[model samples]
Target: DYVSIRVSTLRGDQKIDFNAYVKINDKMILYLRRGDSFEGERLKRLKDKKLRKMYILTDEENSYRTYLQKNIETAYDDTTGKDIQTRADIIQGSQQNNAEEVFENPENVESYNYCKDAAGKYVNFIMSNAQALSAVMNIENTDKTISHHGVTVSTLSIALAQKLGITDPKKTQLLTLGALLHDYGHHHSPLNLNQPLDSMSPEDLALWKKHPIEGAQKVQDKKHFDQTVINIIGQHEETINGTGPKGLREKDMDPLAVLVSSANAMDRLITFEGVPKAEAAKKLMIDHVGKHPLQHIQHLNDILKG
Candidate 1:
């Protein structure tokens, strides 16, 4: 039977057999065992095509496209293979072994450009219907393993921004940039990489601590972001005492900075190890929330719950 299977974006492993329409997880993923040829004829009708391109380009837009066209072979395919061994294995919820690859280079940068372009297109389409954009904006993300989390951040920021009455185009742009690039530096941070990225000595901890600074510098060098936003990337790790690497500024910083800081923190806190979503959410509220105030964490909680 011809069927469309849910494939992981990282490894292209079949995740689900979309024989029927079904909403699973937070969203729906459906594929055909086999689909009608009507789609083929419908697609083939275009013999000549004129595609539109943007006139203005930012460093991100330029860099992102190049990044997506590049590819990286993963070292941990064995784990991914084991996890996705069956059709049901596809929906196995939790971060996949290769899920972190979304932050990876060549492919990651390349993919970001694709997303940047898509987001721009979406923004334009939505702007054409300004009335709808202002309509309380629930705008849920269709989170695939790769791009969804980042996009969800941006989506929630939009909703929050709207709620807070932040209408400035420039501020909204910065928010989007913050959401997209927040996790990019994580690429260099060691998780399950086969070899330790750096020694775990004091020197290693210090070196690893450079990721936020490195992340800020990366964005700054591109000049794609303002100093406020660029510098704020490193602050996501800051505690109330400003104990983050730079630790020069924290809650007293800009509002957008605070916004991104909490967004990143909540994503980290709410994800559980070998636990259920309900359990993770509860744990985050019970344990992590006490680490900080709900006012700081509430926006993120609202997003995860929403």
Candidate 2:
């Protein structure tokens, strides 16, 4: 049996490891096979007839996912010494891919390991070059998909650390990984988070609120994450006030976790709600007043301009 896959999931100009099939006159016809390069012009033509997906063996879904994951992960290994903007592009793209892979394979042993490796690559590039921070600041995420949100959050979180003059590489690296992987629990979640929390059923809301704790637990087997990293993953949704999932106040949460939380809220306004740039900042500030530190909220909003 075959499962339908969104065509957009396939990266163009890459060697595919799974066979793709399309329907013709009610019969599935071979479209592309293993070892063939996947491209979109042909897929574009199909979309002209209202087709937006192709089929692959249900069991090969993992193979398809692996192919997409490797495309970005491998890029990190060779992407150094590229132009500043290009390296920045790789870091952000790799972040999105890293999140996608780990989210999909949350229980898989190697998933977190690969993300740790990817996070290190991202931190190294941003920390190594003076120009890299500006490059990171330049990335534009207009579509605001789930995985892409990781990139923006990570970018803003790290830039906030730098703008605050937090010079420790270890601290910066923790922020980078924290922001990028903050939402991994959503993959483990059964409810759709895009909907307003106020609208969920009582049962749905209960399970939904557990995502942060669930996310933190998923990464525990991987030794690469320290306590701070775990706190960022678990406490990213927590607020200074006792209103968040875990209800830990200002005194309890890690500073990096607060950074990720503030960054997450800003991104939700700007990207998810589609608020205007300046308006989003103002709205975010208003929403979090008396909760997040005034300076942290102010500097994070500055990243919205880029």
Candidate 3:
């Protein structure tokens, strides 16, 4: 009652039966006791040709997408720290309410845990998909607060770094760590930030801006933090116009820091406009590539268009 499939090539020949596992797109799977192997050159040639013309992403972005494709709906399960209760608590207690209070309070201790966990996954994805930088250009963070923003920032940073051709694994990882932890302050950022910055007290506003520095401080005592990551977190706010708190322009910021800023700016501009989530993302992309990152936007454009 069983069926067999005969496979033959100049090199050898074999017969396959249903006992072998069915793989969707595998070029070849394990063989039975046959002494012959099929020449898959034709099939492999077609596959390679298609693959070469496929997404031109770097290894990092490949890693990023692979992670996402694997864990699409189970983000909360990606790590122990990403539990819903903690996530909701972080969102409401720290990012939603006054951010400063969370850090001062006991609950803010795990704020960076989710961000750090997601950073590793995102960095790998971005590095792999860097060639299709547009894949990252479309990330739209939810309005829940800075918790999601951490992932957004890390995603964009790796894309930009990849576009700039800086693919060093160590450097890329450092940037990923910084982007992931950049919002360490948002672990307990003030709630009600939907209001204008002018509406908040000077101290509150100042504290808001100091999230980067505060993040650096939080990680300073941690044994695993690398200096490059801390530096990127501290200086990502610098602007091209010499208008940042450091009184320095893009020229003074670390190259990686500059990448962080681009990611942050693109993320904020696209997602903070108060539109519906789906519509907001597209609208922001139109505005961002056209205005904010006009010059460098083409790199992302090519990726998406391809």
Candidate 4:
């Protein structure tokens, strides 16, 4: 199902005339056609009828898709220029025992906002824009690695959740946040996205294994985050066999954590190791069959098969 556009959020600059549709009885019904403006009266009636959102028919030539792409690029650029620098500063500052000032810096707030906004844009595109998913699936370059990888895992995690018929918005939302930041600890690591664990020196491996705990610790104290979100971040590296960095088992792991772990591993295989998506999906199912819930892995297979 395509995501619904919030009726209240429509703006003058948005190209809504020919791109809007509504869903009823699980079918997309066109409410606006090419050159037709979104009427306030009609929207108000929809609101009165308890409908606040509508979907767009997916088309390769859809202008809304182009609009979202522009926005995504802008957000990515902003994060790359300013937020990345702030992140570097924070990592260095923390290493030097000046972490408090790192967070206090005004640029850090801007960086946080940039990340939040970028994350939101990605989720919006995943839910509402068709081209977004295609872009993620086809991305193979390593130029911006972190954001691209984050988007990949986030997209796969949510797509798998959807295929499993998980309709809880909260779970999807938390999963999205978790997938986006699963590598937060990697910020302090010397490894790049393509760097394999086997290639790391013992010293590098020691630093690499600490990301899950460090990532979890980074957000654990924040009052804005819920426990599940913290669990996903902290326990993402944990496995069902208790062989993870923290040695957490199935009973000790969050279900969402398992999904993220699955997503993270699958993405790494495809993006870093250059495995075909289908082959990678099959490998994950086989490798973690007993370790992760069988149903979750099965759902992942269904997604890839589709």
What residue pairs clash in candidate 2, if any at all? Answer: none
lDDT-superior candidate, 1 or 3: 3
lDDT of 1 by residue, 185-222 (tens): 55546532122322356665665577677776666665
Candidate 1's displacement at residue 294, Å, is 3.1
Model 2 local distance difference test score? 0.70
lDDT string, candidate 2, 149-169, tens digits:
777788778778878898787
lDDT (CA) for every model shown?
Answer: 0.41, 0.70, 0.47, 0.58
Query: 1 or 4, which is superior by TM-score?
Result: 4
- Rank candidates, TM-score, best first: 2, 4, 3, 1
Arrange candidates by lDDT, descending: 2, 4, 3, 1
Error of 4 at 40 (Å): 35
Error (Å) of candidate 3 at residue 261 is 0.8
Question: At residue 128, what lDDT does model 3 achieve?
Answer: 43
Best by TM-score: 2
| TM-score between model 3 and native | 0.51
